[PDB]
Amino acid sequence: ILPSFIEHSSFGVKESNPYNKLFEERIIFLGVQVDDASANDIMAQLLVLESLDPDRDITMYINSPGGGFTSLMAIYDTMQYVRADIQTVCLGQAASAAAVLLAAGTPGKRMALPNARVLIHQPSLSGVIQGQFSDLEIQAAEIERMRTLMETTLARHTGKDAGVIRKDTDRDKILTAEEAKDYGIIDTVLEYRKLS
Amino acid sequence: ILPSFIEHSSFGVKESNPYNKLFEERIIFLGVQVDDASANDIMAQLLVLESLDPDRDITMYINSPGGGFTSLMAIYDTMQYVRADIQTVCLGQAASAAAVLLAAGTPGKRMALPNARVLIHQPSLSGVIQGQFSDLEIQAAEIERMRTLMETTLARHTGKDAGVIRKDTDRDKILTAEEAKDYGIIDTVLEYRKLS
Amino acid sequence: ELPKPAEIREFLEGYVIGQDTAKRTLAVAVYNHYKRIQAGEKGRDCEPVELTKSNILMLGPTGCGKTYLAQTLAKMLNVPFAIADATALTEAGYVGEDVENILLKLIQAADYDVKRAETGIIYIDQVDKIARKRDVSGEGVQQALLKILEGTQASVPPQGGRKHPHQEFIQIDTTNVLFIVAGAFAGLEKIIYERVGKRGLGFGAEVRSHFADVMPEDLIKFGLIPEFIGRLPVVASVTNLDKESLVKILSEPKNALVKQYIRLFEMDGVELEFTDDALEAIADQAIHRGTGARGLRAIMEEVLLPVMYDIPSRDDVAKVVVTKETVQDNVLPTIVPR
Amino acid sequence: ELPKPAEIREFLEGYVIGQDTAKRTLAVAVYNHYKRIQAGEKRCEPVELTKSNILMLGPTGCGKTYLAQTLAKMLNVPFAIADATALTEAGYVGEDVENILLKLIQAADYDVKRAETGIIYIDQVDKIARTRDVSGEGVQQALLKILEGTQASVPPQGGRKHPHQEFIQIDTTNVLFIVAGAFAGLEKIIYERVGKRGLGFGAEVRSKAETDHFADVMPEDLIKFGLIPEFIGRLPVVASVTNLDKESLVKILSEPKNALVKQYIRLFEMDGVELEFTDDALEAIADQAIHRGTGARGLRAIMEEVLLPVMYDIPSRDDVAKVVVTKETVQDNVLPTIVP
Ligand SMILES: Nc1ncnc2c1ncn2[C@@H]1O[C@H](COP(=O)(O)OP(=O)(O)OP(=O)(O)O)[C@@H](O)[C@H]1O
Ligand SMILES: Nc1ncnc2c1ncn2[C@@H]1O[C@H](COP(=O)(O)OP(=O)(O)OP(=O)(O)O)[C@@H](O)[C@H]1O
Ligand SMILES: CC(C)C[C@H](NC(=O)[C@H](Cc1ccccc1)NC(=O)c1cnccn1)B(O)O
Ligand SMILES: CC(C)C[C@H](NC(=O)[C@H](Cc1ccccc1)NC(=O)c1cnccn1)B(O)O
């Protein structure tokens, strides 16, 4: 359930759900799994917010469990393409593709929350892909293309060697926010700002 | 069933729930299980209500069986982040993760209705995580990090030692409203205010 | 003579309370208007400069003294003054008032002498209500005033020289005719707050809990064409009146509000008095009334409504409105004659 | 012979700073107007010349009227400043489009053969555009016969047409029609064709502080604006007034003949107080005038804003000099050079 409020803006009596209000303040929200249908949404929002103002920062909230690699690199390329700097904030988990999108933000502008979880791991095939050994040789050279491209991506954004990413993403490397700050996924753990 | 009209006014298809009425009075409602989609909703509402007025207290109603840990710490961090104090009110139950959000209110502002229960227990894995023993050693260091993080969260909000949270959340520790006041989850068992 | 801006403001202080930045603006700009007259009518170098007017756009909430600061300014001008509304104006064409009838109001205020009316001041009231988002009374009035606000050889369409059936038009040069325009611009303080306020949201961005920082892009987002704001370089910035100004608006000005109620009770032979706590209690209920100093009257008409009914049916000499009569409706002290 | 376009230019440069393209045009076009009137006395000439009317485009306050008001001051040809918003289609209230010919005949001192060789400046023809629309598109309908040249019966009543009177017959086949307008929604229409998209991959998205110079404008863009296709073809010359940059607006403050800084130094001299500016201050005033975004009119919006605490205090005092600095532009105060 999502309650909807009313904004008395230049017009007033404008009904708005909190997600439209995030997007009005240039906050793209990645809270669902990174699949094609989610990546299609985020890339459309990244191009709209680049068009509305290419100078103001787009903020990307990441509560995603991560997902498809081509959906990852669809969002990744659009985050890197737009003229606006991307401010990635991790809210809860950034796992799999999401931690790559979390590291994909503009340097200086990658945040998490103090109890956020950053889970980096190598690509995996969801379920068994079957076929002839010539088919499987293609699919395995492809997931090594995906594994190398993910580590090359995390090498550009964490400042680590891609072989260091390869040793770290052998298993599920779960980082906390302070551990992902030292790793280079983020560089701000984002202290709480409550007045009390 | 939920009574709700649609005013149109040739500007919108404007919906009016009782939840929209509660959200106008800065009442965020956690009435479902804390999953990603619930946590995504609650965090978007906490940030909207911080932006609308960061001085007035957000109220969070909690009638929830509790769910995922990263969805928990998504809501938890966004609660602790916003400049507004958070009045957590327990309705009926706050179990598992939702008792942590109930304790996560501002001190003095954590309420429970008199027949609400507060169910605290250690994190679990719903279902079996398969894998090699190196994968499972990662997943078990994770569930111990989740357990330690939940206990140190309940330590800093109940004023208990985190080892006392260990011995209490070893099994299901169901508290009443008055037992959660003595434990430190809530600060006020909320008195009835009926005219008669 | 050329009364200085301190002397113009001192006249404005006698009627208008508060409004320092608007009185200083409308005293400086009237003084610059008095100086660009007898510099275009006398001439001297070096490099002899043809001066050009700086028209005024007044902006502030209702009741806060935009029209009243112009009506006060009307009572001191050595130049012709024409007050006019833009809500009656239309673009040249459609049925409403033409934008050269505001020049006819200035020709009529100059006793049909065009050389004095070329030195005049026109006050176009309610230019926030010719605002756009075609519209012929709220988009095309910008398009029609803009030739007048910059200076043109306009000709007034009725009544050229007391209606001779040949040459019903007389020329007027609006180059040296100062224009003061005004309006509430009620939705504009929500527009200005988007820029100078920065209502931010979310993790990171700063979260926060009006007419003095007015850029032309705010007036375009209010809906006014970009040509129309450039003719109005001066923003007067009328401010919202607090409690401490509304107490003084009751009693300090020449035609003050409680001065014209004690005048009403003197027609009944009754000396109306106010405790100073009652004047504060009236102004406490006028800032909540939300209509400026026009809401000071709305309080005193209902504080004095049971008083104004029975007091002319009685023999009294003194009536004292205490603070207990204002915060809730209270009985009458009524000092009997003696 | 009959002042050259470089000579018309250097008169315009004495008043107008910048707009070099829209000063070559209106020097060329006025010289071509002069050569057409010079050819209005004949010997042997088997070819007759046409108007070449001017549609002058540019953003607000950047000098279109001020180009025409300057061009009024040299012209040797009668000159009417008209306004298209004042006009209305015939049969309807308000003025009709034969008033702008009367304003030329009045400018020619009721010498019609001089007014048949005139120049009319119709100001703000972007405001005649897109149920009859008597004040918009209907003006363009009534005005195209005036632009291309017709035997127009002009009422000497003052401008309000009414069917019975003697008229003034004027021929506008040699009257030049400089027309102008802000065209505030046209740079988006031009950008739809000459530019890339405003959105998406492989597009050119632009900052909010950066107008097209109105130099890529074509009638494809002007029909989509709201001008009828008949009105545009009768305006063959495109004059592009450009948005004034910082380097032009620092010159518009101090360099021209009735320059803005010269206006205020004149105002303070009438208080007996010498006004002067540091050059860093004039650059700071022209900085904030691009932020106003109303052209050279935004310069006056700052000079009144900077000198408002000054012009209240100076006439009540005794000073000799004033020195306005960058700090007196970014922070409102007053600090004269108090007289010995
Ligand atoms: N600053 C002031 N000092 C003294 N009296 C004031 C002041 N402002 C308003 N008033 C009183 O309020 C009445 C209305 O003033 P005015 O016409 O200026 O309001 P306004 O702001 O122009 O209204 P609106 O904006 O709704 O057109 C006047 O009769 C005047 O006596
Ligand atoms: N290039 C320039 N050089 C010097 N002064 C200029 C220049 N451009 C504009 N100005 C100044 O700006 C003022 C307004 O100019 P103008 O009357 O041409 O307005 P405009 O921009 O044509 O308005 P609109 O576009 O709405 O017709 C003039 O008084 C003039 O002194
Ligand atoms: C680690 C990053 C690169 C992404 C992680 N896993 C992958 O690489 C994902 C896992 C996945 C998700 C949904 C459907 C199918 C497969 N890999 C792919 O998307 C994928 C798709 N086609 C061929 C090969 N791999 B994440 O989803 O756990
Ligand atoms: C006690 C608090 C921390 C939360 C309780 N349970 C958990 O810790 C939850 C139980 C759960 C819920 C939904 C899906 C999967 C697992 N733990 C997790 O969210 C979780 C998720 N991934 C790995 C390990 N644990 B509650 O939901 O009973």
Q: What is the DSSP string of D245-283?
A: -HHHHHHHHHSSTT-HHHHHHHHHHTTT-B--B-HHHHH
Asked if B81's CB is within 8 angstroms of A113's CB, the reply is: yes
Q: Does A190 touch chain B (CB under 8 A)?
A: yes
**C241 CA to chain B: closest CA distance, Å?**
24
Q: Which long-range contacts (CB under 8 A, 24 or more apart) does C3-8 make?
A: C3/C31, C3/C34, C3/C76, C4/C31, C4/D315, C4/D316, C5/C30, C5/C31, C5/D311, C5/D312, C5/D315, C5/D316, C6/D312, C6/D315, C6/D316, C8/C73, C8/C76
Cβ atoms of D57 and D183 closer than 8 Å: yes
Cα(C171)–Cα(C113) distance, integer angstroms: 11
Backbone angles phi, psi at C300, to 5 degrees: -75, -15
How many Å apart are CA D136 and CA B158, to the nearest integer? 73
- Beta pairing class for B5-6 and B15-16: antiparallel
Report the residue of chain A nearest C206, measured CA to CA.
A193
Residue D302's Cα: distance from chain center in Å?
22
Chain A residues near residue C191 by CB distance under 8 angstroms: 10
Could you tell me the two tokens for D182?
A: 């802000």
User: Binding-site residues of D for ATP, please?
Assistant: 59-66
D145's tokens:
């016969």
D205–A51: do the CB atoms touch at under 8 Å?
Answer: yes
- DSSP, res C157: S
Torsion of CA C178, D244, D285, C185, to 10 degrees: 50
CA pair distance B128, C84, nearest whole angstrom:
81
A53 to chain D, closest Cα gap in Å:
7
- Cα separation, D280 vs D152, in Å, equals 55
Q: Which residue CA neighbors atom 14 of ligand 1 most closely?
A: C63
Question: How far is it, in rounded angstroms, from Cα D139 to Cα D83?
Answer: 11
Element spanning C258, H or E: none
Tokens representing A131 are 């076929």
Q: Is A54–D205 a contact, with Cβ atoms under 8 angstroms apart? A: yes
Please name the residue that has the structure tokens 């809500």: C87
Taking CB atoms and an 8 Å cutoff, what residues of chain A touch B73? 92, 113, 115-117
Q: Residue C162: is it exposed, middle or buried by C-beta count within 10 angstroms (0-12/13-18/19+)?
A: exposed
Question: Beta partners for D169?
Answer: D153
Catalytic residue among A38, A71, A96, A157: A96
Do C and B touch, 3+ Cβ pairs within 8 Å? The answer is yes
Tokens (6 digits) for C141: 């009035």
- Distance between CA atoms of A143 and A127, rounded to whole angstroms? 13
Helices (H) and strands (E) in chain B, counts: 7, 9
Nearest CA to ligand 1 atom 17: C67
Torsion of CA B145, B147, B152, B155, to 10 degrees: -170
Q: Count Cβ atoms within 10 A of the Cβ of residue A186 and give its class: 0-12 exposed, 13-18 middle, 19 or more buried.
A: buried
For C288, counting Cβ atoms within 10 Å of its Cβ (0-12 exposed, 13-18 middle, 19+ buried), the class is exposed
The residue behind tokens 């485009």 is D57
Q: Is A133 exposed, middle or buried (0-12, 13-18, 19+ CB in 10 A)?
A: exposed
Residue of A124, A170, A174 to test ligand 3 pocket, by largest number of atoms within 8 Å of CB: A124
How, if at all, do strands C56-59 and C234-235 pair?
A: parallel
**Active-site positions of B?**
96, 121
Contacts of A149 (CB under 8 A, 6+ apart): A69, A73
Using an 8 Å CB-CB cutoff, list chain C residues near B78.
203
Instruction: Please name the residue that has the structure tokens 């950008």.
Output: D191
Gap between the Cα atoms of A131 and A125, Å rounded: 14
- What strands lie across the sheet with D54-57, from one edge to the other? D79-83, D119-123, D176-181, D54-57, D237-240
Classify residue C210 by burial, with Cβ atoms within 10 Å: 0-12, 13-18, 19+: middle
- Cβ–Cβ of D207/A55 closer than 8 Å? yes
Counting ligands in written order, which one lies closest to the CA of residue C186? 1
CA distance C202 to B51: 7
For residue A17, the SS3 value is: coil
Amino acid at D159: G
Contact status, residue C294 vs residue C301, Cβ threshold 8 Å: no
Determine the residue among C203, C222, C224 to mutate to test chain A binding: the one whose Cβ has the most chain A Cβ atoms within 10 Å.
Answer: C203
The packing angle between helices C20-36 and C67-74, to 10°, is 40
Cα-based angle A36, A37, A43 (whole degrees, multiple of 5) = 80
Measure in Å the smallest separation between the Cα of A43 and chain C Cα atoms: 21
Subunits touching C (CB < 8 Å, at least 3 pairs)?
Answer: A, B, D
- Distance from C-alpha of D223 to C-alpha of D231, rounded to nearest angstrom: 9
CB contact under 8 A, B74 and A65: no
Nearest to B98 by CA among B13, B147, B30: B30
Yes or no: say if D275 and D328 are a contact pair by the CB < 8 Å rule: no
The four Cα atoms D57, D63, D66, D68 give a dihedral, to 10 degrees, of: -20
Residues linked to residue D54 through DSSP beta bridges, in sequence order: D178, D237
Instruction: Kindly identify which residue of chain C lies nearest to residue B79, measuring between CA atoms.
Output: C203
- Cβ–Cβ under 8 Å, residues D253 and D285: yes
- Atom 27 (ligand 3): residue with closest C-alpha? A67
**Any A CB within 8 A of C187 CB:** yes
How many angstroms is the resolution? 2.2
Instruction: Please state, in angstroms and rounded to a whole number, the distance separating the CA atoms of residues C258 and D75.
Output: 63
Binding residues of D are: 59-66
Q: Which ligand is nearest to the CA of B129?
A: 4
Which residues have C-beta within 8 Å of that of residue D10, sequence separation ≥ 6?
none
Contact B87, B107 (CB under 8 A): no
Q: How far is the CA of A66 from the centre of ligand 3 (A)?
A: 8
Name the phi and psi angles at D51, rounded to 5: -70, -50
Extract the runs of DSSP E, i.e. beta strands, from chain C: 56-59, 81-85, 121-125, 153-155, 171-173, 178-183, 234-235, 271-274, 318-321
Q: For chain B, where are the alpha helices, taking DSSP H only? A: 18-24, 36-52, 69-81, 97-103, 133-158, 162-168, 177-183
A25/C200 touch (CB, cutoff 8 Å), yes or no: yes
Of residues A25, A113, A190, nearest to C201 (C-beta): A25
The residue type found at A185 is I
User: Which residues are CB-contacts of A41 (< 8 A; sequence separation ≥ 6)?
Assistant: none
Q: Please name the residue ranges forming H helices in C209-331.
A: 216-222, 226-230, 243-251, 259-266, 276-287, 294-303, 305-310, 324-327
Candidates C203, C206, C208, partner chain B, best to mutate (most B CBs within 10 A)? C203
Report which of C32, C34, C107, C19 is spatially closest to residue C67, judged by C-alpha positions: C19
Yes or no, beta carbons of D316 and C47 under 8 Å apart: no
The verdict on the CB of residue A56 being under 6 Å from ligand 3 is no
> Does the beta carbon of A66 sit less than 6 angstroms from any atom of ligand 3?
yes
- On the 0-12 / 13-18 / 19+ scale of CB atoms within 10 A, C255 is exposed
Beta strand pairing call for A110-112 and A173-176: unpaired
Q: Does D188 touch chain C (CB under 8 A)?
A: no
